Amino acid sequence: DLGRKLLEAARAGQDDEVRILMANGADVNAADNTGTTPLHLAAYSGHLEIVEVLLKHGADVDASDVFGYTPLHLAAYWGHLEIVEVLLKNGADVNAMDSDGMTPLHLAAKWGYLEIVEVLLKHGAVNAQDKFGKTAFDISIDNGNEDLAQILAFYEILHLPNLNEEQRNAFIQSLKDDPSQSANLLAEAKKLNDAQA
């Protein structure tokens, strides 16, 4: 049973066993009844090289399990920066949502992965609300993570349509003087954004 062997080797990080299983015609996109594929297990376990091989042989980069998790979800949840970069480089939907409406940005913000949040925003990650109506910034505020709230408020302020350059740079400079106030400045910015619309 080559599919099961490929799933086991993908989860255990056995690179040469994955190569040999591929050489015998194992299905790159073999999924168990939960919808979990070898790319899922390699992105979850943190095996970058197996991610690169699987993607090289045609692994579905946007395969979702019965919970709605894509491999990008798993890489963001478990803090695998380089696997996030590799999956995005191979066309992963940066805005994929799970059963709870959560994007990889939500899961990366949940654990305070600053670099993964940066990489996701570089690839055009969108600000979305989960089932609880919460954004990645809200998650940043529920936790005591000042840096993450500062970055996410930087991006929210950066993308407001009705602020002019002097106001936007004033809010950004106000995000570098005291980051503890990142939650208040964004609200001030949003009020101004809606007064000039």
Author numbering: 13 to 209
Reproduce text from the manuscript describing this model.
Here, we propose a method for generating proteins and protein complexes with complicated shapes using fusions of alpha helices. To design amino acid sequences that can stabilize the alpha helical structure of the fusion sites, we superimposed one or two turns of terminal alpha helices of connecting proteins using a molecular graphics program. Then, the amino acid residues important for forming a fused helical structure were chosen from the two natural sequences in the superimposed region. Our method does not require complicated computer calculations for the design process and can be used for the assembly of artificial protein complexes with predictable and rigid structures.
The second example we chose was a fusion of an artificial ankyrin protein (designed ankyrin repeat protein (DARPin)) and the protein A domain3. The DARPin protein, mbp3-16, had been previously selected by ribosome display from a large library of mutant ankyrin repeat proteins as a protein that binds to maltose-binding protein (MBP). The fusion helix was formed by superimposing 6 amino acids of the C- and N-terminal helices of the ankyrin and protein A domains, respectively. The crystal structure shows that the two helices were fused into a long continuous helix with nearly ideal helical geometry Figure 2 Fusions of DARPin-protein A, PKA_RIIα-protein A and PKA_RIIα-DHR14 by the shared helix method. (a) Crystal structure of the DARPin-protein A fusion protein. In comparison, the fusion proteins PKA_RIIα-protein A, MrsD-protein A and DARPin-protein A ligated by the shared helix method have negligible structural flexibility at the fusion sites.
